[PDB]
Amino acid sequence: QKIHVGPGELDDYYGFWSGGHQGEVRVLGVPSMRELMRIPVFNVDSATGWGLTNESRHIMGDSAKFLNGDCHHPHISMTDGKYDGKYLFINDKANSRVARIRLDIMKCDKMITVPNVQAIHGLRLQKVPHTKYVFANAEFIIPHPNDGKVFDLQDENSYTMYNAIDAETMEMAFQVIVDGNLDNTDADYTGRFAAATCYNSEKAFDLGGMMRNERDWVVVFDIHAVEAAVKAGDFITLGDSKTPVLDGRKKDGKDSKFTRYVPVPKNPHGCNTSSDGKYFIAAGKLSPTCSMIAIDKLPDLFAGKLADPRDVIVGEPELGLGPLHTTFDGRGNAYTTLFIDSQVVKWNMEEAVRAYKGEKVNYIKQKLDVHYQPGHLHASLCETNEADGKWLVALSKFSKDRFLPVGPLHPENDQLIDISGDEMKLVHDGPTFAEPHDCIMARRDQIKTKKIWDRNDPFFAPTVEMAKKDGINLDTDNKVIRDGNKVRVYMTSMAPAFGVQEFTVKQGDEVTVTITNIDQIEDVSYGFVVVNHGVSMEISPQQTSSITFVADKPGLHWYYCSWFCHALHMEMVGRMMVEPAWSHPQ
Amino acid sequence: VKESKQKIHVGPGELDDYYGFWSGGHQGEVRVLGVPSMRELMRIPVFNVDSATGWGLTNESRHIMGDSAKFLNGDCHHPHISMTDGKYDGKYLFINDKANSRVARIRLDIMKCDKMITVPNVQAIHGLRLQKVPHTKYVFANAEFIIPHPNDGKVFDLQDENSYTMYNAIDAETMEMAFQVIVDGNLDNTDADYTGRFAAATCYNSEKAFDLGGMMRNERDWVVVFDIHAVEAAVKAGDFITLGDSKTPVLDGRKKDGKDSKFTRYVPVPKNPHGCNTSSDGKYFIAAGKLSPTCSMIAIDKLPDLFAGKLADPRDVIVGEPELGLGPLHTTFDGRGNAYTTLFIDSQVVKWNMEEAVRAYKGEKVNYIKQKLDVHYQPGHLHASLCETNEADGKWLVALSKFSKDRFLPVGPLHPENDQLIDISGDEMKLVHDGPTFAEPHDCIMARRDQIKTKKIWDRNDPFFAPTVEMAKKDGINLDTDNKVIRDGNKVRVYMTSMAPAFGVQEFTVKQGDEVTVTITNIDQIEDVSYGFVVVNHGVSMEISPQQTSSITFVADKPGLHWYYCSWFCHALHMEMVGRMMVEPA
Ligand code: CUZ
Ligand code: CUZ
Ligand code: CUA
Ligand code: CUA
Ligand SMILES: [Ca+2]
Ligand SMILES: [Ca+2]
Ligand SMILES: [Cl-]
Ligand SMILES: [Cl-]
Ligand SMILES: [Cl-]
Ligand SMILES: [K+]
Ligand SMILES: [K+]
Ligand code: NA
Ligand code: NA
């Protein structure tokens, strides 16, 4: 298996890295591990103008006021248990959002603030029959309502909820109140069941209390029961949100019909569905084990045919210190990160199941040292029934001496490991910024991207509607529209000239500049920057972009094209002239 | 015969040989790479807002940024490392912001931006380079765009006698303005000699036009040479004016009715010249011809005669004008007597011998061109290791090309730049690595591993957060031990230590509308154990590395219980390293 990609060779897989608390998504080439693109999501990107342009702020909605995010879990939409390459979704733990990236244009095209929750952490996608729902965990217990009258996590109205977002429309589908809290989550290969780990069964706020119980649980959701109750109208709503809310809590030891709670030690973390669909596998973290939930025993569990919820556990292998996450090679082996032991341990799932029944068998196959303290890990296509067992990425949290010193703040170390053979082989150390937690890989042939924007793309359709209200045809017009103290400039662009090279406004006017790149040549992107006004954005071929700013400074103010586009790039400029307020009324 | 056969692979547990400091381009940051692996080791926020570390949100960063903290964007091009005696001394990195007219300084011991200045009375800081000898006393910065003085909206004519741009000198150590020199025309790139007396800058708009054709009209623009000693003499003697409300000494470097200033000479050079590069032997300022398929070589040792009036014609300091190819933009040096120039149109790097080009200029029939190497595609800057020092070592060359086209996996309409590593250690340039990068780094700079010395943990007296230490002192707080909430009207100042896995203050209560400052001191002494702080749904995020104090201010505008958490995976109990802010209503 080739590990080095030379000049003119292409990578075999795409990798989509979370940006961690930096807030973007990063597109890597695998196995070269080089970053091919950055996709801004919750960060403000000076380069493309994401967070500054009207198109991006419209997508972000009211949350456009935040300049930060904290993202952990990117996942690719699926059809029948295989990636279909349409969308990537990812969480924001810092401001409680889910974002959708359209994989044809590699941009964030939708974003939602999950109502009535704090901190979206775990996120995974329904597999079968396709990604109808995005499942998302709200991690922190809060009062409901959270109006500052009650603060006690022990109140009967303090809780967190499990969230289902409609993948296609990116609106809330439903929420399920749970006991405890929620950490990570995954879904089965039938569409009936999802599952989530919980570490705060104690509903405590301090360290000791959160560690009190020897077992917390994996909570299992019967999605068929939730849907049926939603169609029957058997639900409530919270606050101002119309989102159907179902109660998945136990009431006096009686299970709800939407959930079952399977006791699992201890403050368990990762929750990973095996690629053969047999198991939800929960990483024990404080317990040196993983717990294997047999998915084909879940119907019986939900029909009362099992005396004890532990009866769906068919394995609990002892692996090592600090198990956090598990992935799959498609050959019947599972790979689990041991954070404290700083290793990846490869183990055979059916043999672990044998050992649970007593048939003493050594299910552990290999322990590979990693550098150092691994969190998530990801084997190529591991979330699909096409898991190909070629590559494994272990994403470690301390790099220490593995890279040149760069000051007190160190990079992370995401290590590429060959798993095509029987022995795991460490091949490459990839330093990364801001702590990617998880990543997802896809074959090169599973992703199909556009090289030119479509002119009706919804990303900027609101801007086209604006232009229409002004009588503008964006493909041809270079016009300055005046409207009271608003000025709407529309121009085309074709290197090395802006279609409008100067315009005049009044001091204090609110200026919107809308630019359509009418070039057809791939890779010929233009930019637009207004000097000393904090204005910057990208316009790629056939895209329309716009940005609004206040002309608060009189005098002559240059704008220029930021994207090197032509030998005469330095000369693709224009001038905004701002007439002073003392020469205009008031 | 010596062949180019340097190793390019840096396997797990091996370390790179050189640091690379990349401009972040339109994205606004500085990036630290390892060479020859070309992996990004660290991101240093400068003009961007970084969600991960909180640069742009924290009080320490907004203090350094000053009033320009209101801007969320920057546009970088030219990173340069301070020198002593014509060799890198590893103290500081400087870089420009073309979008909002700033210069920033990065301290290479902590790899943080520690000072920032908005250059007064100019628009668009583009070209930037450092004094070399006797050390980097001055940062030289080009303001690209001609503007009226005053720019108060009375006069817009760029042909007005008070419309001009200025060459800028910043005190490298204080990061205060040293002086400004008014020039004719505009300014593109700049470099400095090896004595400290001279600096030079290309100018592409000798015609002071606003339109593309207008600024290409002159057969020749020029490189303007500055007699820095003479400027210093005038400043020391008080022979200067000031502009507007800036106390910066302003000297007039324009021609006056054909009469030369004492501070400048204009050397005619074809045509819209771009790069301005000092050869590592100190003999030449080399201007890349852009529209002219040439470079022009100015003999620095003829400049004293030029300013003394001994030379008949300013063209007499031109000692070579080799013809290289279409679209010369920039030049670098191997320390062996060869120059290497990017050919933007021909899409090549051309290697040529400077002394042979000088002899050809006299009429000798000698081919100074050694090799043309195809690059992919349209190169702008290029950089050979240690090229800006008298230690130029002739080992590595990076060419930073603006169109990557098919050299990487497609990632949608926006493509990465292609920064290509080229082995120049031998007689033949050899292309060895294609490096995709985001947002158009324009230029980069390499330093030997042993030229950079970094801190492993913060010093408690570090100037970076000295203002915060001063605030704490006013509140009577010992930041190394104290965990306290100070109430001051509707202001609340929380001070806490932190030690994984617990915040030193795990809950506090405020009134709705209070302005909350949270100051956190990481008292861990273990390298790499960084902590974070995020307030859920409040747009609040920051890094606290070992022995650092960081602080951030936000208004508690939402009643209820609001969780905060450590964003930096730091401990097996990371998930449980949390606290609660309780906000009382009404
Ligand atoms: Cu957010 S947690 Cu193991 Cu996923 Cu990193
Ligand atoms: Cu700003 S220009 Cu050839 Cu330096 Cu990139
Ligand atoms: Cu348009 Cu560069
Ligand atoms: Cu503190 Cu993770
Ligand atoms: Ca627990
Ligand atoms: Ca010109
Ligand atoms: Cl997981
Ligand atoms: Cl240059
Ligand atoms: Cl040579
Ligand atoms: K880390
Ligand atoms: K580009
Ligand atoms: Na939305
Ligand atoms: Na300053």
GROMACS .gro file of N, CA, C and O and ligand atoms in nm, chain A residues 198-202 209-213 215-216 266-267, ligand 5:
model
   57
  198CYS      N    1  -2.395   0.761   2.839
  198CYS     CA    2  -2.419   0.860   2.943
  198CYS      C    3  -2.313   0.845   3.052
  198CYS      O    4  -2.280   0.734   3.093
  199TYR      N    5  -2.259   0.957   3.100
  199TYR     CA    6  -2.162   0.952   3.209
  199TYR      C    7  -2.210   1.020   3.335
  199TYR      O    8  -2.148   1.001   3.441
  200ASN      N    9  -2.318   1.097   3.329
  200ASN     CA   10  -2.370   1.168   3.444
  200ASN      C   11  -2.506   1.112   3.486
  200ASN      O   12  -2.603   1.187   3.497
  201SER      N   13  -2.513   0.980   3.507
  201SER     CA   14  -2.637   0.923   3.558
  201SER      C   15  -2.675   0.982   3.692
  201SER      O   16  -2.793   0.982   3.728
  202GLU      N   17  -2.577   1.035   3.766
  202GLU     CA   18  -2.593   1.098   3.897
  202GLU      C   19  -2.655   1.237   3.891
  202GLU      O   20  -2.685   1.294   3.996
  209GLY      N   21  -1.923   1.353   4.226
  209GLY     CA   22  -2.058   1.305   4.205
  209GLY      C   23  -2.076   1.238   4.071
  209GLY      O   24  -2.145   1.136   4.061
  210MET      N   25  -2.015   1.294   3.965
  210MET     CA   26  -2.022   1.236   3.831
  210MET      C   27  -1.953   1.101   3.821
  210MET      O   28  -1.973   1.029   3.722
  211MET      N   29  -1.872   1.065   3.920
  211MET     CA   30  -1.803   0.937   3.921
  211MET      C   31  -1.861   0.839   4.023
  211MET      O   32  -1.804   0.732   4.043
  212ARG      N   33  -1.972   0.875   4.087
  212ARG     CA   34  -2.019   0.796   4.201
  212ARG      C   35  -2.060   0.655   4.159
  212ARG      O   36  -2.011   0.556   4.214
  213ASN      N   37  -2.150   0.645   4.060
  213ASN     CA   38  -2.207   0.515   4.025
  213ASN      C   39  -2.105   0.428   3.955
  213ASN      O   40  -2.029   0.475   3.869
  215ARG      N   41  -2.180   0.190   3.746
  215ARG     CA   42  -2.227   0.190   3.608
  215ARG      C   43  -2.314   0.312   3.583
  215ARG      O   44  -2.394   0.350   3.669
  216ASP      N   45  -2.294   0.373   3.468
  216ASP     CA   46  -2.393   0.459   3.405
  216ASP      C   47  -2.470   0.374   3.303
  216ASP      O   48  -2.519   0.267   3.341
  266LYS      N   49  -1.776   0.274   3.282
  266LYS     CA   50  -1.812   0.359   3.395
  266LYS      C   51  -1.777   0.499   3.347
  266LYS      O   52  -1.663   0.525   3.302
  267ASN      N   53  -1.873   0.589   3.349
  267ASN     CA   54  -1.865   0.713   3.272
  267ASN      C   55  -1.823   0.676   3.129
  267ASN      O   56  -1.724   0.730   3.077
 1177CA      CA   57  -2.110   0.852   3.631
   0.00000   0.00000   0.00000
